[PDB]
Design a protein around this ligand. Sequence first.
Ligand SMILES: O=C(Nc1ccc(C(=O)N[C@H]2c3ccccc3C[C@@H]2C(=O)O)cc1)NC1CC1
Length: 167
Amino acid sequence: VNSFSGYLKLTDNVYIKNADIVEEAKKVKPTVVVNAANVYLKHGGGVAGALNKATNNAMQVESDDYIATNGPLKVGGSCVLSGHNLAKHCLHVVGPNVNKGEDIQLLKSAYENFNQHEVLLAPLLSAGIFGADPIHSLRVCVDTVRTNVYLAVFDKNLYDKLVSSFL
Ligand SMILES: O=C(Nc1ccc(C(=O)N[C@H]2c3ccccc3C[C@@H]2C(=O)O)cc1)NC1CC1
């Protein structure tokens, strides 16, 4: 038993909710919140800008030190940093950005990072300003992630379309 409430169950291990991931993180305080990161950990907009704003820019300060030490992530890769006031940990995962021409096949590699964590609160990777089809992202998530994932979908219209079209 865990504290995630109001989710629709899609499969054995994947759950979905129309919710603001920032508000959901603030209420649940999950062990892991996933950020929709880029390779530079520049949290300017989309989910990342929202999560970072909620940390009063502490996420960005920590991220800049991480990059100065380690260099950029890979597309499809991840790193674990602090969750600040939102979660114990933040798993920064880089899905491909279609608006940069990145290979959509890397979306499966991106979701594989979730399997290193037993339970996660997460957005749909590569959705939103990353330019991928969220229906496709949900399918890759279900077919790749084996650990327990609670997906927060900000847009109600999109949420309803995701549920109604789910196979
Ligand atoms: O501002 C926010 N919360 C916020 C939450 C989500 C996004 C957001 O853009 N989410 C989508 C996104 C973005 C990049 C990559 C993938 C995806 C899939 C995500 C989706 O559609 O569900 C923005 C702001 N709270 C402040 C109180 C106001």
